[PDB]
Write a protein that binds this ligand. Sequence first.
Ligand SMILES: [Cu+2]
Ligand SMILES: [Cu+2]
Ligand SMILES: [Cu+2]
Ligand SMILES: [Cu+2]
Ligand SMILES: [Cu+2]
Ligand SMILES: [Cu+2]
Ligand SMILES: [Zn+2]
Ligand SMILES: [Zn+2]
Ligand SMILES: [Zn+2]
Ligand SMILES: [Zn+2]
Ligand SMILES: [Zn+2]
Ligand SMILES: [Zn+2]
Ligand SMILES: [Zn+2]
Ligand SMILES: [Zn+2]
Ligand SMILES: [Zn+2]
Ligand SMILES: [Zn+2]
Ligand SMILES: [Zn+2]
Ligand SMILES: [Zn+2]
Ligand SMILES: [Zn+2]
Ligand SMILES: [Zn+2]
Lengths: 106, 106, 106, 106, 106, 106
Amino acid sequence: METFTVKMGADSGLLQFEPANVTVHPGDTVKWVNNKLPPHNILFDDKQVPGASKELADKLSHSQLMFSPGESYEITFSSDFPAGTYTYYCAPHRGAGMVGKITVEG
Amino acid sequence: METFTVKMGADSGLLQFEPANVTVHPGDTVKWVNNKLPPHNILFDDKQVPGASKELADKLSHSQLMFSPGESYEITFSSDFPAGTYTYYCAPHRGAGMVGKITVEG
Amino acid sequence: METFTVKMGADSGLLQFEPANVTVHPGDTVKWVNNKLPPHNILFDDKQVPGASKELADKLSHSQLMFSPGESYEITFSSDFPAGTYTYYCAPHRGAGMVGKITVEG
Amino acid sequence: METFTVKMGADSGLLQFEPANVTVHPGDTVKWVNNKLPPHNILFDDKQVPGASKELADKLSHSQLMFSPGESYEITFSSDFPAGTYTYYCAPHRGAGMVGKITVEG
Amino acid sequence: METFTVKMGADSGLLQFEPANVTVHPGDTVKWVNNKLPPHNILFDDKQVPGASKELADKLSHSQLMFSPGESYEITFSSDFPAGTYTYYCAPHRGAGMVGKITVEG
Amino acid sequence: METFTVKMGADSGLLQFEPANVTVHPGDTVKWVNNKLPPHNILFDDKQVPGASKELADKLSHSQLMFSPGESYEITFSSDFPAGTYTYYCAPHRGAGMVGKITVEG
Ligand SMILES: [Cu+2]
Ligand SMILES: [Cu+2]
Ligand SMILES: [Cu+2]
Ligand SMILES: [Cu+2]
Ligand SMILES: [Cu+2]
Ligand SMILES: [Cu+2]
Ligand SMILES: [Zn+2]
Ligand SMILES: [Zn+2]
Ligand SMILES: [Zn+2]
Ligand SMILES: [Zn+2]
Ligand SMILES: [Zn+2]
Ligand SMILES: [Zn+2]
Ligand SMILES: [Zn+2]
Ligand SMILES: [Zn+2]
Ligand SMILES: [Zn+2]
Ligand SMILES: [Zn+2]
Ligand SMILES: [Zn+2]
Ligand SMILES: [Zn+2]
Ligand SMILES: [Zn+2]
Ligand SMILES: [Zn+2]
């Protein structure tokens, strides 16, 4: 049972989540930490989560912008969460391809 | 049991939903398709749905922007949904009066 | 039992919630009325409401922009709402420190 | 010696200049009038005027936004102006292809 | 021969130039100093300066945004400047009525 | 005599002018080419060019946004341009420190 940290804005100054792709196990937690060039947010589309569930995509999205360095958000993927891929994106930096994918393994 | 299709942005290039007003029967589905001049989204204000239920207005809204041509979002109005009007709008094009109204009938 | 009115944007023209800090009881209602310099919205971060409950913060947030004068949003704090502080802000005027705080008491 | 009027935003509500293409004679004047869905402006890029003269493109642009209905801006093409095409666009509505072209003839 | 300082954003936090109205004499200088709630800029419309001269309105406009406190801009009104009123506005805060007027006396 | 190319947005995806700092001679040309993550523009503040000449800073600024890849703007620095440093920036990516500097030598 582990916590994976994802940086919001690469140290370099690149507009990415790093790491962009993470694989986690039921019981684990992804923690987003505000890093370079804020603001960022974390959105999952209706069609971009297991079973295309809007209820679930909405529950997980953190649409509110995160401004100061240090600001964070955790999603902990309990065994209620269906296995599969959770593709998310940052709204202000969608143009730049600020994208991420979480895979919940088996 | 049928699916009504609403275009986002008229073929003409006008910034409206087309058709803006639709009447539907319980069990039917409304499907928005991204047509002209993206991006669009679909918002239902708290006071704009039967019983002014924010819980329900929120469930239905798709506040995330739809950018690419062909993207779609469906609401299907099962027998849980109260009879009456559901009035909505596109945030980016609020200024242009890009508004719509679904009427759940009988 | 009562309804506390909160102006969005002060009479003077300052970008504030007025009154900013409010103490309510179980059974009471907070009503936000659109006043000066719209648009405004009312956002609760996940970490900013008792128990740090995102479910709660999301249910309470009115992220949709309120534009026309006199537009309103009420939250009525029943026995169900946990006692404690609910700290909110206005997205468009966050830079200006357009912030507020509701304290549910006993 | 005449004045051609160009509407900013078609009566239909379409985001174009109307008429988008105009031919004028030396000594004539083009007058833009703010019509539907303000705000608009008029920009001529450096490379979009005869001889790709930035000095001239800049003179002609009215980058400031026109907000209220009835606002207008005139260019009058005296004999100083080189013969040829002057292609322009509206910044806010670039995405919608709100573009126009004046042709100074003979 | 004097320099009139104008604050960009009132100490209170109000979105105004203070003083909003200034009367100056040929040879004097108005100095805008970035104060509260940046960014601000200073625009004069074509029609808003003596003789409706776009050449003059453009020369005087400081459209570029001013971000850090302390940033400034001077216009010194030599006797080439025609007497009369120079109405200007801040673009980001046009909605708020962030407006100013300089009168060049006799 | 030569043309110095400056990429707008680095190959890597960083929001930079590349090369940022450039030394040119009288007779030489600086060409900005639109590269990654558009749009960009090229702004010279009034205080940021030799003699603090606004006339000069404005003549040189390309405030209009460049959108499509390969779009370009050249400034060719003749005997007429005062020796010294011309410091520029990109409005949209100012937050990211998308800055540059041209030094005209002897
Ligand atoms: Cu981002
Ligand atoms: Cu739309
Ligand atoms: Cu506000
Ligand atoms: Cu327009
Ligand atoms: Cu301002
Ligand atoms: Cu840039
Ligand atoms: Zn694990
Ligand atoms: Zn969607
Ligand atoms: Zn039916
Ligand atoms: Zn509402
Ligand atoms: Zn009472
Ligand atoms: Zn009470
Ligand atoms: Zn948060
Ligand atoms: Zn003619
Ligand atoms: Zn250009
Ligand atoms: Zn004086
Ligand atoms: Zn004008
Ligand atoms: Zn050479
Ligand atoms: Zn050289
Ligand atoms: Zn300046």
